[PDB]
Amino acid sequence: ARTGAEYIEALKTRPPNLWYKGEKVEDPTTHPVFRGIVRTMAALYDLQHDPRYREVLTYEEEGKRHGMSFLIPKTKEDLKRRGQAYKLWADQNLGMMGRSPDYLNAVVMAYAASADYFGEFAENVRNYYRYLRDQDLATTHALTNPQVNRARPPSGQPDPYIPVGVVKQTEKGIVVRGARMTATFPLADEVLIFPSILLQAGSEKYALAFALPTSTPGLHFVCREALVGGDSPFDHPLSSRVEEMDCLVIFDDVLVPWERVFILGNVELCNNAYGATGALNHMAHQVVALKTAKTEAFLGVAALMAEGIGADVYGHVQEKIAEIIVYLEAMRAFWTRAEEEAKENAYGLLVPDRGALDGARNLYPRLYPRIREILEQIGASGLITLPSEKDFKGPLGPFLEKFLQGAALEAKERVALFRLAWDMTLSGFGARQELYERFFFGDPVRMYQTLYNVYNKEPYKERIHAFLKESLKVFE
Amino acid sequence: ARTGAEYIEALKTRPPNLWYKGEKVEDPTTHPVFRGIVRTMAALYDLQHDPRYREVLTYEEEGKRHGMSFLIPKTKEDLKRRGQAYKLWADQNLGMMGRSPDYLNAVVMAYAASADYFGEFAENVRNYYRYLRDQDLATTHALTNPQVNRARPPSGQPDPYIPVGVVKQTEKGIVVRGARMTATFPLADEVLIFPSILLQAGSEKYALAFALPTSTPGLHFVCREALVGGDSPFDHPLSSRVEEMDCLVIFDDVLVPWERVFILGNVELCNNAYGATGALNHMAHQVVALKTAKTEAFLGVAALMAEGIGADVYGHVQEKIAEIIVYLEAMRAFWTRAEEEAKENAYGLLVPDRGALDGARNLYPRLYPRIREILEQIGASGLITLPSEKDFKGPLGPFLEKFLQGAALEAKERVALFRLAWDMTLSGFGARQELYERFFFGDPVRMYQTLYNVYNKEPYKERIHAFLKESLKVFE
Amino acid sequence: ARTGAEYIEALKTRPPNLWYKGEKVEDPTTHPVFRGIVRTMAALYDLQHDPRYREVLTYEEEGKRHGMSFLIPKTKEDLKRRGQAYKLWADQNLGMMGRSPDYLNAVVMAYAASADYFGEFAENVRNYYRYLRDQDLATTHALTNPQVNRARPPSGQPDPYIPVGVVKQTEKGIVVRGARMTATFPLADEVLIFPSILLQAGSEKYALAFALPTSTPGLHFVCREALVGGDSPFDHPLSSRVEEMDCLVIFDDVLVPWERVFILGNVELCNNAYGATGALNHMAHQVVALKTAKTEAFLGVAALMAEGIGADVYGHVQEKIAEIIVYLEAMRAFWTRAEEEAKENAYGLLVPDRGALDGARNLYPRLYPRIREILEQIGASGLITLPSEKDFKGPLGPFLEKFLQGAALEAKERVALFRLAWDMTLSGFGARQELYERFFFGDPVRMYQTLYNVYNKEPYKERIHAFLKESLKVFE
Amino acid sequence: ARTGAEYIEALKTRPPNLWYKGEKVEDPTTHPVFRGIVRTMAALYDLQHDPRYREVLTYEEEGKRHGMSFLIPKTKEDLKRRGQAYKLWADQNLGMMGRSPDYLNAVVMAYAASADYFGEFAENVRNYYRYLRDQDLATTHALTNPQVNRARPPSGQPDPYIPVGVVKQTEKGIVVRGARMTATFPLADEVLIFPSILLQAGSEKYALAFALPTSTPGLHFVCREALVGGDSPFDHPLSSRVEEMDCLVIFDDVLVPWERVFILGNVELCNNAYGATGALNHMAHQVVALKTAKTEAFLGVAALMAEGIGADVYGHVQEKIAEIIVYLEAMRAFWTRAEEEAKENAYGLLVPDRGALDGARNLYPRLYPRIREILEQIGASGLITLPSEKDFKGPLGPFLEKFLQGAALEAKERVALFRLAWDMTLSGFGARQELYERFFFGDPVRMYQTLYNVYNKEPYKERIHAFLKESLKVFE
C-alpha cells in the first residue's frame, strides 16, 4: 500500500504527459491547476496507513498489505469490505471525486479473476493486476471515441485513425494511432485504454484493450479549461482540492508492448469484456457507494442551509429535504441488495447483483439533477451572495458580520456554508459535476436501451399470459 | 386458516352493513357489484390449503395452522417468510388488490407484540389479535376524518360529531357518533377504527382506537359508484374480479364493548401508535412486496404490448420499458434492505427497517403515475380500440381477426392483452388505481413533512461541519 | 344551418353503419350508448338558431345562413369570428367534446379554398364543401392505419389490404378494401377518409383521400367498450352526454363514386395535403380554442373543489391552481398570436400562424396530464367518495347531508361537484380524455420530429455564427 | 441619448462605491473584473447612434432624442416600439444580460406616468424620470431584505436595522441604515431602492422607495466572487463580456435628499406600487422580449451542436430541439398577446396585459432549466472537451484539428461553438444564469401564490356552477 509521499514523488519523477493551454506540464505536484487534486489523492493513500482505518482500507496477504480495492472477494463479507473501503474514501471528498483509482482497480481485479476470458492474453492480465496491486499505482482510463460524426461508425469518420486503431504489429508489440475523447483524473501512473461503446461489427482495427505508463512517448493528455476557483478553502472549499481535470488523449504512433495487450482485434471480446468478467458489477459497486456518499453530502448541506436561514419552518422546504432523504435511502437499498444477492459468474468470481446495480446507475443520473435543483431552490439568492474571506478580513468585515449572519448562525459560518453549496452546484466545478453524473457511465439513451435488451423480461410476460388464459377461455 | 367457502358463508350469514345506491345489500356474495371481489378474496383463502403453497401461506402452532400474516417474526428468516406470503397473495391479482387483509393483520400482529404500549387495554389487544388469527377473519379499516373543512381541526368542523367522537361511556363500553371518510374492501367480518392523521392537541374526544364486527347495529358502509365493468373476463379482466369498493363509514350512536377498545382519549398514544408498535414497519413491508408485484405486472404488460404491435424495435419504446425495470429493481432493493436491516423495537418486536420502507412508500406514489403513463405511451390508440368478445363472436368476427392481429400475434390474444392494459390504466377501475397509489398511505405533502421531521439528519450535518472547519481556519 | 331536430331525423332515417357488441345499431338516437351524444350534438345545432348566438355561430350569404365553421376567412376579423364560434361551441360541453364537426369543417373549408392543390379533383373538393355547408352535415374521420406491425410500412403488413387500399378502378369509381384504426364521434352523416401519417414512398395503393355517407354498403363502424356511466346528470355529469365513442372502420370492398375522390395514388399529394391547403392551420385553430375552453373548465372545478373543502388556505394548493392559470394563459396567447400573425398561403387562403399553432398543439399534450394530476392532488379522497343521488334520496340521506358537506357548501352541491371532477379525470370517460389529449393530433414522438424538420432554424444558427466571429478572430 | 464614451467617462469620473475582495474598486472601466461588462453596456449605448438602429432605439421629442425605454406609450404601436428596442438590445448579448437598464427605465417610466399614485412625492417621481431620461443614465436596483431569518418579518430580525430602515428625518431628508441583499449590474450611475417582497403590516420603518447616485457617501456595493473566466473571446465567449456581477448593498447611515424620496412609511403604497403604476406590466414586457431573445440563442446553439457532431440524425435529438422551438413560440405568443390586449390603467397609462405577462414570467423559470438540460444532453462530453485557443496555437494544434473536427465542421469552429455552449450552461457564468432565471422576478413559491390571489377566477367557477345546475335538478 502506497503512502501519499510515494505517490507525489512518483508523479514528480515520472509525470504524465499532460498539456495545459499549449504548454507541457513539467511538475503536476506544484502546478497551480493540478497541485490540489494531487494533494487530495495523496491524502487518500495516506489514510491507508492511519491506525483507525488500516483494517478498512487494506488487507494483508503473504507478508504484504494491499489496498482493499484489489481484494478478490470470495464471500459476501469480502464484498462488504470492498464496499466499506469505497465509502470511506468517497466520504473524504463528499463524493465529489468521481474517478478515484479504486473504481478502476475494481475493473482490473475482475479482469484478473476472470482472466481466462482473455485467452492467450490471460497471463498479461493477471500480471498487470499484480503489478498495479503491488505498487499500488493510480490509474486513469479513456473508453470513448472522438465526438466527430456520431452519424457514422468508428470506421466511417473523416479519417481512419481518428479513433485509436492498430497501425501495425511488430515483434515488440503493436503501434497505435488515434485518440480517445475523455480521460478524467490524468494524475496517474497508468492509463487504461479499454473498450466502451458497443463496437459495430467490422471494427477489428479498433477492438483493443491495453494499458500504458502515462509518460509513454507519443502519448499526450490535452487538458480542458481548468475549474480550480482558487486556493482558499473558504472561497473554494471543493474546487481548490477536488478538480480532477478532463482531457483528450492523443496517440501519436504509440508503441504498446505485447505484455500490456489484453485484447486485440476481437470485436466480440471487447463488447462483452465488462459483463463477462464482472468488471461492470464491481465498478458499479464502487459507484453506488460513491453516490450514496455524495447524496449524504447534499443532504447535510441542504439541511444546514435551510436551518441556517430559517427556511426549515416552511413545509415545502421540509419536503424538498425529505426528497433527498428518499433518494439517499434508494441508493442505500440498491447497495444492500447488490451485495446480498451476489453470486459467482462463469469464472467463479463473486459479483454484486447486476439487477440492483443497473437500477442504481440508471436511476441516479436522473436523481442528481433534481438533488442539485433542490439545493438551488433552498438557497436562492444566498447562493450568489458570496463575499470572500478577504471581504471579512477587510474594512467592511464588521458590516458583513451583521448583514450575513443567519438564524443563530454567525456570518462567517453562514458564508462558508453557502460558498460550499455554491461550489457543489453553481461554480464551474459544481456545474461540471452535473454533466458528469448525467454521462460518466454512458449515454442514458443507450444505457436504457442496453438494459432493455439484457434484462430477462420473460417471467413477467409469462405471468401475464397465464393471467390472460381466463380471457381467451370465453371463446371455448 | 380459513377456506374460501368459510369466508363466503360468513359474509352470507352475517353480511357487513353495506349500502349501494340507496339500498341495503342483503347478500354481497351474490350482488352484481360485490360477488367478484368476494370470489377473489375467497380464492386467496383457498390458496392457503393448496399443497404447493401451504408452507408459504401458513404456519403451524400448537396443533393449529394460521395465516402467515399473523406470524410474530422472531428472526430475519421469519420476516422473509411474511414477505413471501405477501408477495404470493399479491401476484394472484397482479398487485391490483390494495387492501387484502394481510396488510391489516400486520398492523394487529405488531399491536399485539407491542401490546404493553396500550397500557390497561393491552390484554384487549392481545385477545383481539388471537381472535382474528384463530378465526382467520377479514378486516377493513377507516382512519381519516370527513373531508369537510380542511382549514380547521377535528374539533372545528361544522358539527362536533362529524369526526368519530365519544358521546358517553357506560358500564358496557363507549358510544361513538360520527363518520370516517374512507374504508376500502368492506367485504370483511371486522372493521378497524384506528388512528391516522396526526391529531392536533385537544382532540381527546376523537383520540380513539377500536374494532367492531361489520354488522354492528348503527354501523353503515355507504358505497361509492361501482367500477365493475362487467363479468366477462375478456372484456373486463380486472374490474370483473378486483373491484374492492370504497365507502364512507357512518356511526349512528354505535356501542363499542370495552373489550374492543384499544385506545381511549389519549392523543399522544394515538399519534405514536403505528411507529411505537412497529405496525407502520410491518404494514409498509406488505406494501413494498405488493408494489413490487404490481410493477412486475406492468412490466409484463408493457413488454407484451410493445412486442405485440412491433413497437419494441423503436429505441424510445425500449427505454420506456427499461424505466419500468429500473423502478422494479428500486422496489426490490427497498424490500431487501428493509428485511436485512431489521432490528427489534422497544417492545422486543423485530421490525423491518424504517429508512428503507419510508423510502419505498414515499417514492412509489411518484413512480406509479409514470409507470401508468408509460403504458399509455406504448399502447396509444390500441388502448381504446377495444371490441368486445361479443364482436369477435359476431358477424364481423372474421374482419376483426384480420385488422386487429398484431405482429405474430392473433387478434383475440391482442385484444385480450389491450383490454387488460386498458383495465390497468384507463377504465374507471384502472384510473382509480392511480388515485389510490397517490394517496392510500397518506397525503404526500404531509408524508414528506413527516419524513423530514422523524429522520435523523444529524450525521450528515456533522460531516459538513467537519468539512467546513478548514474553511473557517483561514481566519485564525 | 341545421337544427337539432333535422340532425336527429337524419340519423334516425339514414343511420351510420354502427355495431356495438356484435349487433347492428338500428337507431343511435335512442340506443342507450349513443342517445346522449346525439342529444348533445343536436343541442350544438340548435344553438345556431338562438337569437343570442345566431350572429356568432352563423353567417348569411346570398339568402342562406351557414355555420361559421364553413366561412372562408378573408380578413383577420373573419379568423376571429371562426375562433369565437369554435369557443362558444366548445364551452357548451366544457371542452370535453373533441371531435365536434367544426374541426373537420375547417379542414374541408381549407381544402376547398385551396382546391387547385387537388388538380383534376379540384371541382370534386369544391362541390363536396358546398354540399357539407349547404346541408350543414356532421362529419367524422379516420386517418390512421391498423396498429398491427408498426415495425413495417403499410405495404409490409400481414396482408396487403389491412390498410385501406384500392382494389380496382371502374367507370363508376374506385373499390377500396381495408380498415382505418380509429374514428371518433361516428354519429355523423359523412366520414372523411383523408391522409394522416406521412406515407413512405411506394404506397401509391394507399395514397387516398375521399368521403362517403356513413350508411354506405360495405362500410362498418365497430364501436369499442362504451364509457357512458349512466343517464343521471348528478351521477355522471359528463359521460351521460359527451361520450363521443371511438370505432374501428372497416371497408369491405366499398365503392367510392368518382365525385367523392379527392386524391388518388399520389403519395406526395397526400403527405402535403394538410400543410399546403392550410387545413392543418385551421383545424389547429379550432383545437387551440377548444383546449382553452377545456382548461377554463378545469380551472373552475379546481378552484371550486379547493374552496369547497377549505383546501384553498394551503399555499401548495394555491400554487397548483396558479399552475392551471399559467397554462390557460399560455393557450390564450397561442390563440391570439395565431390570429394576429395570420398570412395568406400559396392559394390565397388566409391561414392562422403555424408557429403559434405548432407550439399550442405540441405543448398542450404535455400540459393536460399535469392539469389532470392537479385535480387529483387537490381532491384526494373526495374524488372517490361518490355516493349517488339515490343515496341522498334514500334513508341515509340525512346522514350524508351532515358528513359530506364542505366549508360553507351543502352536501348535495359538494358531491355534484366532486362527481364532475371525477368524471373529468377518473371515470372511464375521464381517463380516456387523457389518452385522447396525448394522441389525437398524432404521436408526440413524430409530431416533435416533424416540427424539427419543418421549422426554419436558420436565423438562429446565423446569429450564433455571427456571434462566434469574434471567437475565431483570435487566430488571425 | 448617451454614447458609450459618455457612459465610460461617467463611471471613470464618479465610479460606484464598489468593493471586490476587501478592496475598493477605483476604476471599474479598467478593473479586470468589470471592464468587460462596462464595455458591453457602452456598446448598447453606442448602438443608439448607429444609423441602422437609431429609429428603433431612440425617439425624438422637442429637439431631443431619448432612449426608447423612456417612451411613455400612448398606443399599441408605441408598445410595439418599446418591445422592439428591448429585443434589439437583448439580441446583442444573446439574452444573457438580465439587468440592462431598459428594464428599470420601464419601471421609472411607469412610475412617472402614474405619478399621482405617489401623492405628495409625485413631482419627485416625475422629476427623477426626466433626469434619468435626459441624461440617459444607467440604473441598478436592490429590492430584497438580507436573507437572515426567513422565519421572521423585517422587524423580527437579529437587529432592527438589518433591513434598510429610517433612522431619522431631518430638514434635508431621511437617514437610512441597513442593507439590501442583492443588486445586479452595479456599473450604474444610480441605484433604485424600491419595494419588493410584500411587506407585512407594521413595517412602516422599512416601507421606503428612493433613488441615489451610486457614489453616495455611506453606500457600499460588496461584490461576490467574480465569474469572468478570462478575456479571450474564444475561451470565454460570454463571461469575458457579460458578467454583470451581483452585490450586497450596505447603507451606513446614508442621507437621502427629500427630492429623491418617492415613498415613505407607507406599507400599502409600497405593496401596490408595481401593480398600480403599471411598472410590473412594463418591466415584465422587457422580460418577455429578453427571454424570447435568450431562447433564440439556445435554439441556435442546440441546432449547431447537433448538426456539428452529426447528432441531428437521431430522433430524440430532433425532439429535444423541437422542444426548445415550442418554448420559443410560447414566449413569442405571450409577448404578442401582452401587446395586443393592452389597456389603460387607473392613471391612463397603457399597460401590456398582465394575464399574458404573468403567464410568461411564471412559466419561463420552469422552462429555462429544461432548455439548459437539453443543451447538456445534446453536447454530452463535447461540453467539457474544451482545449484553449492556446492549445490550437501550440505544438499539438495539428492533432487537435484532426481529432476535434465535427461533421463537415472544422475543429476551431467546433471548439468555439462548444466553448460557447459550455459558457451558456456549465461555466460559473453559465450556471449562475440558471439560478438567475429561477429567481430574479421572485420566489416561484410566492409568485404562484400571488398569481392565485390576484387572478379573477370567478368566471370559470360561475360556468361550472351553471353546468352543475342540471346535476342538482334531479332532486326537484
Ligand SMILES: Cc1cc2nc3c(=O)[nH]c(=O)nc-3n(C[C@H](O)[C@H](O)[C@H](O)COP(=O)(O)OP(=O)(O)OC[C@@H]3O[C@@H](n4cnc5c(N)ncnc54)[C@H](O)[C@@H]3O)c2cc1C
Ligand atoms: C464530466 C465527464 C467525465 C467523463 N469521464 C470519463 C472518463 O473518465 N473515462 C471515459 O472513458 N469516459 C468519460 N466520460 C465520457 C462519457 O462516458 C460519455 O460522455 C458518455 O459515454 C456519452 O458518450 P458521448 O459523450 O460520446 O455522447 P455523444 O453520443 O457524443 O453525444 C451526442 C449524443 O447524441 C445522441 N446519440 C449519439 N449517438 C447515438 C446513437 N447511436 N443512438 C442514439 N442516440 C445517439 C445521444 O443521445 C447524445 O445526445 C466522461 C464524460 C463527462 C461528461
Ligand SMILES: Cc1cc2nc3c(=O)[nH]c(=O)nc-3n(C[C@H](O)[C@H](O)[C@H](O)COP(=O)(O)OP(=O)(O)OC[C@@H]3O[C@@H](n4cnc5c(N)ncnc54)[C@H](O)[C@@H]3O)c2cc1C
Ligand atoms: C382510492 C383510495 C383508497 C383509500 N383507502 C383507504 C383505506 O382503505 N383506509 C383508510 O383509512 N384510508 C383510505 N384512503 C384515504 C387516504 O389515506 C387519504 O386520501 C389520504 O390520507 C389523504 O387524506 P385526504 O384524502 O383527507 O386529503 P385532504 O387533505 O382531504 O385533501 C385535500 C388536501 O389539501 C392539502 N391539505 C389539506 N390539509 C393540509 C394540511 N394540513 N397541510 C398541508 N396541506 C393540506 C393536501 O395536500 C390535499 O391536496 C384511501 C384514499 C384513496 C384515494
